[PDB]
């Protein structure tokens, strides 16, 4: 079913306990991510985002991690283990990412992708719920605002 998730998505929700997130959450906007196959059978994620009043593009490679819906990703320099918690290929994908710079330097991140730029409240609740079930507070949860540019808004 991986092929079902190819195509255009929008990062609409983000939650984490990291230092990065805590000190950059205020400047984060919704990004447009196009998904296609990766060399090793994983996924190539090409994202277009607003960094500092500028449209940037980055390519992330989710390497297969031994099972459908499980990937590894090189970030921080650290590596992350990404899993698809729940998803409907025509509507959304709830991803969970866990990393650890070392014993006690463990960070967690919940990401909500959407086929549309608009998010239904029921979907917002699911994200908040999953995020809290992971030890994340509301101050750690944010629904990414739609950028004016860099997306074909």
Curated annotation (Swiss-Prot):
Gene Ontology cellular component terms for the protein in this record:
extracellular region; extracellular space; Golgi apparatus; nuclear membrane; nucleoplasm; perinuclear region of cytoplasm; rough endoplasmic reticulum
Carbohydrate-modified residues: 17, 44
Q: What happens when the gene is disrupted?
A: Mutant mice show decreased susceptibility to passive cutaneous anaphylaxis associated with decreased mast cell degranulation.
Q: What induces it?
A: By IL-1 beta and thyroid hormone. Probably induced by dexamethasone, dihydrotestosterone, progesterone, retinoic acid and retinal. Repressed by the Notch-Hes signaling pathway.
Tissue-wise expression: Abundant in the brain and CNS, where it is expressed in tissues of the blood-brain barrier and secreted into the cerebro-spinal fluid. In the male reproductive system, it is expressed in the testis, efferent ducts and epididymis, and is secreted into the seminal fluid. In the eye, it is expressed in the pigmented epithelium of the retina and the nonpigmented epithelium of the ciliary body, and secreted into the aqueous humor. Low levels detected in various tissue fluids such as serum, normal urine, ascitic fluid and tear fluid.
Q: Where is the active site?
A: 31 (nucleophile)
**Top-level taxon of the source organism:** Eukaryota
Outcome recorded upon mutating residue 33 to A: Reduces enzyme activity by about half. Reduces enzyme activity tenfold
Q: Show the disulfide pairing.
A: 55-150
Q: Is the keyword Coiled coil in the record?
A: no
What's written under domain?
A: Forms a beta-barrel structure that accommodates hydrophobic ligands in its interior.
User: Self-association or partners: how does it assemble?
Assistant: Monomer.
Name of the molecule in the record: Prostaglandin-H2 D-isomerase
Query: What is the species of this protein?
Result: Mus musculus (Mouse)
Q: Which residues of the full protein are shown?
A: 35 to 189 of 189
């Amino acid at each position: 079913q991986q092929d079902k998730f190819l195509g255009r998505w929008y990062s609409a929700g983000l939650a984490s306990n990291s230092s990065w997130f805590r000190e950059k959450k205020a400047v984060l906007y919704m990004a447009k991510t196009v998904v296609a196959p990766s060399t090793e059978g994983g996924l190539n994620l090409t994202s277009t985002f607003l960094r500092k009043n500028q449209c940037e593009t980055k390519i992330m490679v989710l390497q297969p991690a031994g099972a459908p819906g499980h990937y590894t990703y090189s970030s921080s320099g650290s590596i992350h283990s990404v899993s698809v918690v729940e998803a409907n290929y025509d509507e959304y994908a709830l991803l969970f990412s866990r990393g650890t710079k070392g014993p006690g330097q463990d960070f967690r991140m919940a990401t909500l992708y959407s086929r549309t730029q608009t998010l239904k409240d029921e979907l917002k609740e699911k994200f908040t719920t999953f995020s809290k079930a992971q030890g994340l507070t509301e101050e750690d949860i944010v629904f990414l605002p739609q950028p004016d540019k860099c997306i074909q808004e």
